[PDB]
Scaffold this active site. Sequence first.
Site, PDB file in Angstrom:
ATOM      1  N   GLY A  42      39.995 -27.775 -10.747  1.00 45.18           N
ATOM      2  CA  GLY A  42      40.381 -28.369 -12.004  1.00 45.18           C
ATOM      3  C   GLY A  42      40.497 -27.405 -13.164  1.00 45.18           C
ATOM      4  O   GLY A  42      40.854 -27.826 -14.268  1.00 45.18           O
ATOM      5  N   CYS A  57      42.475 -24.691 -13.334  1.00 44.73           N
ATOM      6  CA  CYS A  57      43.716 -23.965 -13.500  1.00 44.73           C
ATOM      7  C   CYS A  57      44.399 -24.379 -14.791  1.00 44.73           C
ATOM      8  O   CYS A  57      44.344 -25.542 -15.231  1.00 44.73           O
ATOM      9  CB  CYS A  57      44.636 -24.196 -12.311  1.00 44.73           C
ATOM     10  N   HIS A  89      51.908 -25.125  -9.868  1.00 49.08           N
ATOM     11  CA  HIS A  89      51.430 -25.952  -8.768  1.00 49.08           C
ATOM     12  C   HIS A  89      50.922 -27.317  -9.218  1.00 49.08           C
ATOM     13  O   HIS A  89      50.519 -28.115  -8.367  1.00 49.08           O
ATOM     14  CB  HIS A  89      50.391 -25.212  -7.911  1.00 49.08           C
TER      15      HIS A  89
HETATM   16  C1  LIG Z   1      43.150 -24.660  -9.963  1.00 50.81           C
HETATM   17  O1  LIG Z   1      44.106 -25.580  -9.485  1.00 50.81           O
HETATM   18  C2  LIG Z   1      42.432 -24.030  -8.778  1.00 50.81           C
HETATM   19  C3  LIG Z   1      41.345 -23.052  -9.274  1.00 50.81           C
HETATM   20  C4  LIG Z   1      40.405 -22.489  -8.082  1.00 50.81           C
HETATM   21  C5  LIG Z   1      39.636 -23.793  -7.327  1.00 50.81           C
HETATM   22  C6  LIG Z   1      38.527 -23.362  -6.897  1.00 50.81           C
HETATM   23  N1  LIG Z   1      38.158 -22.163  -7.777  1.00 50.81           N
HETATM   24  C7  LIG Z   1      39.505 -21.720  -8.503  1.00 50.81           C
HETATM   25  O2  LIG Z   1      39.588 -20.796  -9.242  1.00 50.81           O
HETATM   26  N2  LIG Z   1      43.400 -23.296  -7.979  1.00 50.81           N
HETATM   27  C8  LIG Z   1      43.617 -23.612  -6.564  1.00 50.81           C
HETATM   28  O3  LIG Z   1      43.014 -24.487  -6.015  1.00 50.81           O
HETATM   29  C9  LIG Z   1      44.638 -22.740  -5.846  1.00 50.81           C
HETATM   30  C10 LIG Z   1      45.969 -23.482  -5.754  1.00 50.81           C
HETATM   31  C11 LIG Z   1      47.078 -22.599  -5.124  1.00 50.81           C
HETATM   32  C12 LIG Z   1      48.287 -23.482  -4.748  1.00 50.81           C
HETATM   33  C13 LIG Z   1      47.513 -21.456  -6.079  1.00 50.81           C
HETATM   34  N3  LIG Z   1      44.123 -22.451  -4.532  1.00 50.81           N
HETATM   35  C14 LIG Z   1      42.884 -21.688  -4.408  1.00 50.81           C
HETATM   36  O4  LIG Z   1      42.381 -21.159  -5.368  1.00 50.81           O
HETATM   37  O5  LIG Z   1      42.297 -21.632  -3.122  1.00 50.81           O
HETATM   38  C15 LIG Z   1      40.983 -21.097  -3.133  1.00 50.81           C
HETATM   39  C16 LIG Z   1      40.337 -21.176  -1.719  1.00 50.81           C
HETATM   40  C17 LIG Z   1      39.435 -19.967  -1.407  1.00 50.81           C
HETATM   41  C18 LIG Z   1      40.742 -20.168  -0.630  1.00 50.81           C
HETATM   42  C19 LIG Z   1      41.905 -19.198  -0.945  1.00 50.81           C
HETATM   43  C20 LIG Z   1      43.245 -19.797  -0.467  1.00 50.81           C
HETATM   44  C21 LIG Z   1      43.261 -20.015   1.064  1.00 50.81           C
END
Ligand SMILES: *[C@@H](O)[C@H](C[C@@H]1CCNC1=O)NC(=O)[C@H](CC(C)C)NC(=O)OC[C@@H]1C[C@@H]1CCC
Lengths: 302, 302
Positions: free
Chosen positions: B145, B147, B43
């Site tokens: 940030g 990931c 992503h």
């Molecule tokens: C790294 O990019 C990030 C790590 C998350 C952010 C906040 N805490 C984490 O562990 N990952 C993301 O933002 C995900 C991207 C998707 C495209 C895989 N999305 C995500 O983690 O979304 C989290 C919010 C709680 C709600 C779940 C999804 C509707």
Amino acid sequence: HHSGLVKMSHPSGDVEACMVQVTCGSMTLNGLWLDNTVWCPRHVMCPADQLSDPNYDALLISMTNHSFSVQKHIANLRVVGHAMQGTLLKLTVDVANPSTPAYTFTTVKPGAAFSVLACYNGRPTGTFTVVMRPNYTIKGSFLCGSCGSVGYTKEGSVINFCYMHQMELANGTHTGSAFDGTMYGAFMDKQVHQVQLTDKYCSVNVVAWLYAAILNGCAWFVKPNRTSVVSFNEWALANQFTEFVGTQSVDMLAVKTGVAIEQLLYAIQQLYTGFQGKQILGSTMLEDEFTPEDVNMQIMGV
Amino acid sequence: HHSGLVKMSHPSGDVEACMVQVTCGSMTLNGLWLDNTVWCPRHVMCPADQLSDPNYDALLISMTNHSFSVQKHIANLRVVGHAMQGTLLKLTVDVANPSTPAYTFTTVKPGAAFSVLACYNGRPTGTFTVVMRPNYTIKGSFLCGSCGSVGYTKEGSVINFCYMHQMELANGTHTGSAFDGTMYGAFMDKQVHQVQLTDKYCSVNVVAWLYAAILNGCAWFVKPNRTSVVSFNEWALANQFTEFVGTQSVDMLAVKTGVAIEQLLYAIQQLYTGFQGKQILGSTMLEDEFTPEDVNMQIMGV
Ligand SMILES: *[C@@H](O)[C@H](C[C@@H]1CCNC1=O)NC(=O)[C@H](CC(C)C)NC(=O)OC[C@@H]1C[C@@H]1CCC
Ligand SMILES: *[C@@H](O)[C@H](C[C@@H]1CCNC1=O)NC(=O)[C@H](CC(C)C)NC(=O)OC[C@@H]1C[C@@H]1CCC
């Protein structure tokens, strides 16, 4: 639900590059190599038949420079000077550590967290974090051969060394030296059972944990009722709590949550009498092993 | 009394030297640089207006090599090839990492522990350990940030990478990818709320913790009464426990303590109904976040 709190240590690589093995022909333990100095516990000089009542002054005079063998596994470092400072030796070596980080020495205060790099025979084996307890012990994980393992905090790129491991007490907790050579607390580096002071709950960390709960939507324990800091601290002295001293880190949590410190001091008074079957962040007892800074950093990203 | 158990991570230095920053012009996240390859979450290609339903196949074709900017802070690495494997990108770069450790890729199983190096913008910021939960989430500490942060175990000098961080679920837990590109569990790398499977107590880790108690002289819960593994596992399925599978590590604890596994399976059945005011290692609830190996290593020095 998970709070988002873990026991978080600093990355250990900068300190790993400073660990060496020190042997005097008796025990082998670990040392910390910074610039042209290797720090290690002075009981590396002690034969096992004298660990209970060493005369360290006489041991020190009985050593020469080449009595100390310093080795890096993860070099052989020739010792060219030796000195004792409190419960530590300061060995001067012929090679400056090329991976010396920017560093300071500091003393850590009760309730504050620090990272430990547990080492055996000069080899780093694990890392963990602890809070200094009000009785100047830590609840660590150390075995024979771990002395000289180091504890530290980090400000920016600067590593603040605060702990060098020395001993385990009969109740399973641990203590050690600051890098001015003083033992934390009233402890002595002799293999005898020692008076252990009573531990207490660290009130500021319990407040931080209650804020962590609120930040996770868990606020059943919050009431408009309030206890002042002065009234709470009088209560603390009779109930196995440290006196509360607020900080800017705690104030940030009060601002973010809209819940006043004094509301949580009241909450602590009531919770200490019992949770009445309810849980907070999956716990039935007060948690004091997380700091205001842990909560600000791990949950709020500050 | 303190059990001598802490949450122990591997020293992180070898992995720190592998972390880079990866940007596609949208989000910046972390990557893992081994030999001539950089691994990162796919992503990184996704614009924010498409995080909820990306077409990753079309995104991949829309990228060229120089769409990916890879930077090391703690070099600029020119990307010369790119490929997608499940939920990960495999970027080929022009420079081999000179600090590549000996490594493998492995998948971690529920109940097993691993070390995480939490990174932001390519910079390691903390390390912690978690157990993979029975529902293929972890109870971590991750922010925007993070990931591309990686999880690993270590056998000797060999680092076994097992986890690359991807997302946070609504209940605060976390999940990610193995390095074959599969997400742990049934999760998808799309920003939508997902079915979350029920978690369970990891029975083998609860047994390990009861052995840790015995090893600390805490054995009030041990009775001659026994429950067989087969009978316990039938009970487990109706009571939110994993089925118990013994290992050589557990057998070592039974040998050292003289207490049979089946005595502790009976104990778990009774304790799950309630501790009746008593505590085990300072806890009023069953603990399943420590493994048999943790107990063997930290307490027994094996
Ligand atoms: C790294 O990019 C990030 C790590 C998350 C952010 C906040 N805490 C984490 O562990 N990952 C993301 O933002 C995900 C991207 C998707 C495209 C895989 N999305 C995500 O983690 O979304 C989290 C919010 C709680 C709600 C779940 C999804 C509707
Ligand atoms: C490092 O040399 C070692 C670290 C201890 C070993 C076991 N777990 C540790 O943390 N330190 C020592 O062995 C101490 C040396 C003295 C001379 C300072 N002694 C010590 O820790 O003794 C522990 C046993 C429990 C009883 C207390 C002393 C009677």
